[PDB]
Ligand binder design. Structure first.
Ligand SMILES: [Mg+2]
Length: 280
């Protein structure tokens, strides 16, 4: 049981040391495209960049850059795109990526404002009758419906490629109750949220990869993908107790840097996987 590992780390007060060792073991790959001067305004944070090998490329000759990475989990047979929260000038790029990658779902794990600062642009329309047009990427986006619950909001959006007039329905799953500081006390509502995303078909292989973000696209987004993958692997393997969350995290870190940003996020991820395993 990773629960016995969990209790052991708790009693010995070693979360910080376990987390720092993951930081030390983590892959280091170049982010040369990200660091090009012409892309400075396409990155929110100077210390959060997509690796070149796993970056999502926009299908355009001018500038193909977006701060987004494909995390491809072979054994679990799950793929996720992790990205930063859109910036005022990269909302058109964001929706272009969603279109070109054939994503069905977008998972948002932050509020537009937290700690009194803007953590991303308002990249989706708040009213049915006030649609958004992204002129740079020739896309139209329309709020079709919105269902606000206590811990999350799910929206249906229609995305139209104005060039070909094709439309698609995108589901927007917005977790709205992650605290400004720290992690949630109990993983129950986060797990419920994950199950709602799963139930929608947004994580399924008949669609492109789900797009997941918070402000930077590594902390809470890492937590979401790490929990999902670990739980899938416990369902798939002959020996479920062989699923090692540290090894999965390190594997995911081959595709995007810095996934899980604090020791508290690590502890929380353990908690989510443990409680989620017991529910299943
Ligand atoms: Mg109205």
């Amino acid at each position: 049981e990773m629960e016995k590992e969990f209790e052991q780390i708790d009693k010995s007060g070693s979360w910080a040391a376990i987390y720092q060792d993951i930081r030390h073991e983590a892959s280091d790959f170049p982010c040369r495209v990200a660091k090009l001067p012409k892309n400075k305004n396409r990155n929110r944070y100077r210390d959060v960049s997509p690796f070149d090998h796993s970056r999502i490329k926009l299908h355009q000759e001018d500038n193909d850059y977006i701060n987004a990475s494909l995390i491809k989990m072979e054994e679990a047979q799950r793929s996720y795109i992790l990205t930063q929260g859109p910036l005022p000038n990269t909302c058109g790029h964001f929706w272009e990526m969603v279109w070109e990658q054939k994503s069905r779902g977008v998972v948002m794990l932050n509020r537009v404002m937290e700690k009194g600062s803007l953590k991303c642009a308002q990249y989706w329309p708040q009213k049915e009758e006030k649609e958004m047009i992204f002129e740079d990427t020739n896309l139209k986006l329309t709020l079709i419906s919105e269902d606000i619950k206590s811990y999350y909001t799910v929206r249906q959006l229609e995305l139209e490629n104005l060039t070909t007039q094709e439309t698609r329905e995108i589901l927007h799953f917005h977790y709205t109750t992650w605290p400004d500081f720290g992690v949630p006390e109990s993983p129950a509502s986060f797990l419920n949220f994950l199950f709602k995303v799963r139930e929608s078909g947004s994580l399924s292989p008949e669609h492109g990869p789900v797009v997941v973000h918070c402000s930077a696209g590594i902390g809470r987004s890492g937590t979401f993908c790490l929990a999902d993958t670990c739980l899938l692997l416990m369902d798939k393997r002959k020996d479920p107790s062989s699923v090692d969350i540290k090894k999965v995290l390190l594997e995911m870190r081959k595709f995007r840097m810095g996934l899980i940003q604090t020791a508290d996020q690590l502890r929380f991820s353990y908690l989510a996987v443990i409680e989620g395993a017991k529910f299943i």
